[PDB]
Amino acid sequence: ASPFRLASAGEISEVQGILRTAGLLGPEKRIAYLGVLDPARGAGSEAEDRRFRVFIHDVSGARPQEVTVSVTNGTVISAVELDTAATGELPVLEEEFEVVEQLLATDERWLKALAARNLDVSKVRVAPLSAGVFEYAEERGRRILRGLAFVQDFPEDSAWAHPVDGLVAYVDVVSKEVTRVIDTGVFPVPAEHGNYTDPELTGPLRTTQKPISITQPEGPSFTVTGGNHIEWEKWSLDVGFDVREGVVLHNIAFRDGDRLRPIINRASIAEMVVPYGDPSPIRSWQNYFDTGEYLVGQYANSLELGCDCLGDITYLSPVISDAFGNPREIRNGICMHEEDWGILAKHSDLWSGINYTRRNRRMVISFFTTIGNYDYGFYWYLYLDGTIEFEAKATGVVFTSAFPEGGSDNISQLAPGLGAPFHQHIFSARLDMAIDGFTNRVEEEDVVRQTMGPGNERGNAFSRKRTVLTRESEAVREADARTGRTWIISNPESKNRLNEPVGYKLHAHNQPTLLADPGSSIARRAAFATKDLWVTRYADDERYPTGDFVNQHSGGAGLPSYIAQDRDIDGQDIVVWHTFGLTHFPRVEDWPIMPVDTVGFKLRPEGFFDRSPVLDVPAN
Amino acid sequence: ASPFRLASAGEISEVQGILRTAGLLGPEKRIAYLGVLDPARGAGSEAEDRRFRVFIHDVSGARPQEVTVSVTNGTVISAVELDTAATGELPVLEEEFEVVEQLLATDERWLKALAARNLDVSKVRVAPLSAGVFEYAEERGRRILRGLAFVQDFPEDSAWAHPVDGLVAYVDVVSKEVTRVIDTGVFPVPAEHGNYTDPELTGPLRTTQKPISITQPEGPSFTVTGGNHIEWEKWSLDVGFDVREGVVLHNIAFRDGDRLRPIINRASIAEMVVPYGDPSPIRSWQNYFDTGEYLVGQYANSLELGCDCLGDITYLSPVISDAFGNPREIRNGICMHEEDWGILAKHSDLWSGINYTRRNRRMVISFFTTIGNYDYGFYWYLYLDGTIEFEAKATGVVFTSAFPEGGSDNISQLAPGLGAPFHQHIFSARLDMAIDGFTNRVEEEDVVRQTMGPGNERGNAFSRKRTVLTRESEAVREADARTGRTWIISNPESKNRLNEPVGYKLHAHNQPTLLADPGSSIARRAAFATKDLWVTRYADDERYPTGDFVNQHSGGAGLPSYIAQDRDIDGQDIVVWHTFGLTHFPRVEDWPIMPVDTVGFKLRPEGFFDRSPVLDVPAN
Ligand SMILES: [Cu+2]
Ligand SMILES: [Cu+2]
């Protein structure tokens, strides 16, 4: 049995049983996070000790704990109470989100505000959002949620079309008290509806699209063994799933003839922040840490065939735990399939008379998640030529506000009186590198322009330069699209036939990074987002760029803390953290429902192979 | 019917008859370029007048002429003699390429160079490349091609694997003289073959790739009328083909309700430069102007179904003129098909209970060309949401040299002793803008970061700024990926319902531009490539960023010349020229045959529509 297989429903139940038996899961206990711990550093280590990490919250306000249980031996390996005001609060529970609207509905200040706007309280939906850490000392140690109002005229109506601006409430979800209600002024509530399903808005439906059928008469080319192990066109990997990160890929390797050579030990989107740049007090605290605070894997959708995933699809239905330890499966939550990718290589040679053409194809592993108004698709691609690529697709309904009279420098109009606060969606891919094994290093490669003169008389010469990042204090790098900056992860002791260290080159999209002022809370809490690439010495306890407990943490927690250790990264077990995102000034065509936009990165072999790894692909 | 239809065989033959009748096409004349001209500006279209422009070369050595004929009226509109030493030589003739190897084979200095290397002349292929303008005063006014040697061991051998470095010959293709033979020293000639079809090199072929059947049961969704008029999912356009530019798109328009709205009047890749960065005198003059010097449309491949173009494909077989004025058809030279493009939009709403998912698709129009060792595919994409995108695909065999013992800063090693000089593939897309008509303008949009303080107390705010480029003198812009710089083309007199000028935003990949020293011959001849964006006031004689005659032509024509006019581009008939390219540092993975690498750009609607233009897309 592989130590990388997906956690079984019975394993979750087993952790529940172990926890309750240990008396760590009473009536007031809630599992805020639960996930298996994959194998520590070993090699010939065979002791199958399946362990799970759990964050246990206490509804009575009693200190929460971080517990590690061995589902194999049925024991509690560790259990530590947490001082949340120091180390941060646990992830928000879905139940806590639910209580916000309820409480506000019976709060005088809230009802007072709704009354002044002639808004029927039973029609007002509340988006219960993370609070972060700002200037309210009373919040330290307490679990707060901040709610924003949206009018829903009827059950099937889209409330996002009707933001109630000038109003925000702060709710303590444990004592269940409305700590604050702020009403800066009445703003008219956008009247037009945004029901993209209403024929009055859609108009007659197109009858012009003919069907495109993608089939595989002989089935797929990849094989799935042990439930989540993929073998496809020389590639080898394990598809894992975590409630916090979503799909995680393990042991990405390419079989170069005889040997199965490792490339990336673990690949995942370790974080994703969505900061808002509207200076209004109503939204200036708004910053979603979808992965850290909400847990994107928890909200994974059940993908439909022919709708979400077209073609010959192979599904994985991961199992997560609920607030009480009961296993829950996300039916068809993961799509696995291979798709045509046009031309791989082509050449019509005059001298030899040989005309050669080959088609490319990509293995696709994906999942979609819904975080309130937004929906995000996470796609990992494996190409025939050895390229690894990640692509995040953003859709959903844009978060609205009112559009100020006289316009705004931080909000765009989408409809009459309907505003759309500017914001970014910034991802962090954590890549536990394993280029032909763990001894790796990273070089920053810049294009080098040369001056016309001796040795370059015609001024046509251009070169390249590579700077090795030796210590962590010099591994916080920024982009420079102008000089064609990329980053190469190589293995100093593994050379190709030309006696050069094998490698893989990371190609970033060079999108803008965190725009917020450097002294802001969000710049402190999402420092990872302020730079494009980070390199750290590997450590089993350094899993997220923002830290373990992101919710309401004061700042400096993940990457900036890890880097401060200043460890040696030159030819060591290393991890690459790549920051990449979309800076969003919503447009009229993003309303009522935003068409997909994407961001990503990819890594290509750079002297990894001895020649093209795709010479054996047939004509077809 | 449509003045935008493709030139027919008959029209070509007729142009030949008109030139002949006019005494402009006797036995010593050769057509170096022939193409139909676009209808003149202004709705004042007094019937059909199909005019063609021709560049006529004289094999006896007499001055060439540029001629415009009205194939409709059977007249010569104009015909002028060309002083090629001032205005540039005509594009290279296919026949002139054959010449080089032949002449060299009988030259004593050449045979002497070959003998010094123990190479059999009958086995030495010569790559006859464009000359450019350097320090050879004797070349002024003459049609020169420079030759580089490659050993081909047998008929089916790939000579690219065996470059003969240290040797270059200059040849006058009209007087048929070998003007120069330069030998800098013997180099070992790389021995390994690069026969990617040799079973011994490929190893047994994979038997693991199952079929991926892409079919359209009811046929395609697009219609082709009048030979080249395409109508697909609200889009409307004409697919034209020019021997110099290749596929050209005309009258790109989107049907918005009852109104056919124009977006781009004309789109084409107006130039394509491939500069080499090896300071060796053997190659320091190497710079392919594939479009301007070689003419990409003339080397377009015949695309095979199932191999090059997969799915339900509608082909176009454009007609070009051979060197004598006879028409020549390029069978299946252009592919037109629509393809699935994943998720268009997706949202699962808690509050409304509505889950919505829609698929995207794109109209693809492409062709592939072969310029000696390389092959480039040109792909234009039209998406359901109104996005217009271009993608250039680079493949084939890389241009080799010897890898110097002791390494190199401008050449990389691909095999033992085999080098690959550093180079770039830079394109220029000419976009004759028509955003809701000709009255357009361009703004450069930068993201704006804000300082924490009054009005932005929490330092989270970020904005954007737009600068209107009013005169051509301020319309030569550079990229700034750091500030998310983009360019918006709007129609100041056409507003969306929110009273905002409709527009389209151009998203560049922000790859490095021309690396050469600014004082070099290439920097001046490919000045366009030194900047990302140029905007000009439309002129019927301003068609190429490099001018009409690029072959052995110095700076003095093209964009830098047009720009000096400093015309008004603020709310005028304007043209956008976007420079974008690849910096290729050849890797071992690119040998023996290069796997596809890509580059491009796209334009997305920016307040062009009144809401998402895809609400009428059915689920089915
Ligand atoms: Cu957004
Ligand atoms: Cu290249």
Swiss-Prot record, chains A, B:
Q: Its family?
A: Belongs to the copper/topaquinone oxidase family.
The residues the record assigns to binding Cu cation are H423, H425, H584
Which amino acids does the record list as binding substrate? 288-299, 371-376
Which UniProt keyword terms apply here? Copper, Disulfide bond, Metal-binding, Oxidoreductase, TPQ
Provide the E.C. number(s) assigned to this enzyme: 1.4.3.21
- GO biological process assignments: amine metabolic process
Cofactor binding comment, as recorded: Binds 1 copper ion per subunit. Contains 1 topaquinone per subunit.
Disulphide-bonded residues: C309-C335
Q: Does the keyword Hydrolase apply?
A: no
Reaction equation(s) it catalyzes: a primary methyl amine + O2 + H2O = an aldehyde + H2O2 + NH4(+); 2-phenylethylamine + O2 + H2O = 2-phenylacetaldehyde + H2O2 + NH4(+)
Protein's recorded name = Phenylethylamine oxidase
A Gene Ontology molecular function term for this protein is: quinone binding
- Tell me what induces its expression: By phenethylamine.
Q: Where is the active site?
A: D290, Y374
| Post-translational note | Topaquinone (TPQ) is generated by copper-dependent autoxidation of a specific tyrosyl residue.
Q: Tell me where the signal peptide lies.
A: none
Q: Which Pfam families match?
A: AGAO-like_N2 (PF21994), Cu_amine_oxid (PF01179)
Q: What does this protein do?
A: Catalyzes the oxidative deamination of phenylethylamine to phenylacetaldehyde with the concomitant production of hydrogen peroxide and ammonia.
- Assembly and partners? Homodimer.
**Residue(s) carrying 2',4',5'-topaquinone:** Y374
Keyword Transmembrane helix applies: no
Cofactor(s) of this protein: Cu cation; L-topaquinone
